[PDB]
Amino acid sequence: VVGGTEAQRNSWPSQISLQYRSGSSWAHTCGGTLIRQNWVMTAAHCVDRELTFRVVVGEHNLNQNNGTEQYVGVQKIVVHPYWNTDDVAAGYDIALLRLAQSVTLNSYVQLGVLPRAGTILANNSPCYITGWGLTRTNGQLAQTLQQAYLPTVDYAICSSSSYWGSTVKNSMVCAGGDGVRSGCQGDSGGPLHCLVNGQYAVHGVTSFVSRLGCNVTRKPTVFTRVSAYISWINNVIASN
Numbered sequence: 001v002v003g004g005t006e007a008q009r010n011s012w013p014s015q016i017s018l019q020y021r022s023g024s025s026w027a028h029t030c031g032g033t034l035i036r037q038n039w040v041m042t043a044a045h046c047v048d049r050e051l052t053f054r055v056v057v058g059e060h061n062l063n064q065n066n067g068t069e070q071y072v073g074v075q076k077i078v079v080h081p082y083w084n085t086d087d088v089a090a091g092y093d094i095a096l097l098r099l100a101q102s103v104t105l106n107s108y109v110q111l112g113v114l115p116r117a118g119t120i121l122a123n124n125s126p127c128y129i130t131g132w133g134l135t136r137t138n139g140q141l142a143q144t145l146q147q148a149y150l151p152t153v154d155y156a157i158c159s160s161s162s163y164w165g166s167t168v169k170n171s172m173v174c175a176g177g178d179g180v181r182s183g184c185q186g187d188s189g190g191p192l193h194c195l196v197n198g199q200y201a202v203h204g205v206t207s208f209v210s211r212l213g214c215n216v217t218r219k220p221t222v223f224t225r226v227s228a229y230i231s232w233i234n235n236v237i238a239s240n
């Protein structure tokens with residue numbers, strides 16, 4: 001997250017760190033949202049590589065013991081069947097990870113609230129992106145979980161020529177684009193939390209930013225629109 005501030009430890013308890021095994025250690029690669037005690041929602045592109053993955057819940061600082069972490073292997077990876085790695089702009093950038101064990105819920109580990117199917121946010125709706133992604137374009141990952149206020153940019157505006165044009169689909173949510181604050185590499189798969197009727201819900205799964213850079217004016221961060229996938233998510237959980 002570029003232009004973020006450090007999240008409080010208990011603000012975003014559905015946020016997870018998706019990590020892969022690298023030699024004798026583990027490396028953060030993406031975020032995700034805990035949606036059941038044994039299921040995580042993340043981006044399809046986060047799991048294109050043939051890696052060994054684990055999920056960390058109750059994580060705050062990637063580089064030190066928080067006394068709250070639970071570490072769990074990934075048992076099954078269900079990518080949306082229409083996902084195509086060659087074409088992030090097509091959408092379908094979503095995957096569900098079935099965890100090898102069910103995690104224990106507490107102040108630091110909670111299920112993310114998902115929007116009702118089909119829900120669309122008004123332009124400029126209040127949302128926060130969270131993650132440990134790069135804190136600058138071509139920068140380094142955050143140690144501590146970051147948050148940035150990224151108001152939505154509606155589909156009409158976001159798919160206009162000066163923004164993302166036809167690259168953005170109605171299956172996506174855009175947010176930010178102020179040139180200062182944005183998601184960045186390593187935030188992919190994590191939540192966009194938006195305030196609706198007094199409750200934060202996870203409306204987006206971070207998907208892409210501009211090739212030109214993370215915080216680029218009129219290139220808001222693009223997210224898979226969770227509310228377009230409620231049936232798909234329910235269908236997967238019910239059959240696995």
Ligand SMILES: [Ca+2]
Pocket residue numbers: 059060061062063064065066069
């Ligand atoms: Ca830690």
